[PDB]
Curated annotation (Swiss-Prot), chains A, B:
The active site is at R96. This is Putative RNase YutE. Keywords: Hydrolase, Nuclease, Toxin-antitoxin system. The gene is yutE. One of its GO terms (cellular component) is toxin-antitoxin complex. It comes from Bacillus subtilis (strain 168). Pfam families: HepT-like. GO terms for molecular function: RNA nuclease activity.
Length: 143, 143
């Protein structure tokens, strides 16, 4: 019934958690080098959420997203994450265009505050995904 | 005849030179934070080249690209950069997919080697662009 790219998802969740751990580390984000590292972390956190969300939606025959911005709303509808978690994650996702397209405008202090403000929802995201996977597919299989 | 986004190009070159100068520093790019910073730098350098390329092509009514490889090839065709500079920059641009899409596979050691190998072509890129702008538009005007 469901063909879920579980290897890809669980891979990307591990990667995500590593980057979050690094965010929670004792850096100097105010460095030059610190600013650049924080931009990469922000970009990676966002991409991992979007990619995982797409893989979830495709695998579990959820409503198709019109744009990457619709992904969280669908995960909320499907009770993958809470409404409040979804709204919080959306606020970080809204930074994507600045990071990838309007990069002259990227502001690492702003981005720090954004990630910090939603750190609990970020930490919980892999847990939500894994619980859903375990509930729907069991402990081992992608199908 | 030509309406070129010279202010966008010039500000983009400035930002590019700034990131390139951060690369040529005494920094440990192998640390967890350093690795992330270098990835951001690599991404930024690539995007600056492609965006400036696109702005040059649009402004000067050059051939419409159907590829990123095509952007550099068109700049070569139009005598903006040398054939060899074009080739060298395409080798860095070849890493974009890894940095932006297949980011689980990003290897900051591979990236360091890529940027180092083509450092001169990178340093000369803004010079090439400014020289073309000066010749075609004069020292002041965008049009």
């Amino acid at each position: 019934m469901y063909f879920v790219d579980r290897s890809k998802i669980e891979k990307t969740l591990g990667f995500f958690e590593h980057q979050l751990a690094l965010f929670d580390s004792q850096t100097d984000w105010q460095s030059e080098i610190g600013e650049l590292a924080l931009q990469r972390i922000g970009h990676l956190l966002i991409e991992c959420i979007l990619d995982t969300g797409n893989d979830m939606i495709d695998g579990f025959i959820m409503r198709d997203p019109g744009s990457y911005d619709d992904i969280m709303d669908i995960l909320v509808d499907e009770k993958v994450v809470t409404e409040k978690e979804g709204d919080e994650l959306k606020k970080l996702i809204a930074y994507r265009k600045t990071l990838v397209q309007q990069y002259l405008l990227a502001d690492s202090g702003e981005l720090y505050r954004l990630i910090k403000a939603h750190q609990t929802a970020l930490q919980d995201f892999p847990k939500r995904i894994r619980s859903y996977l375990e509930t729907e597919l069991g402990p081992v299989s992608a199908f």
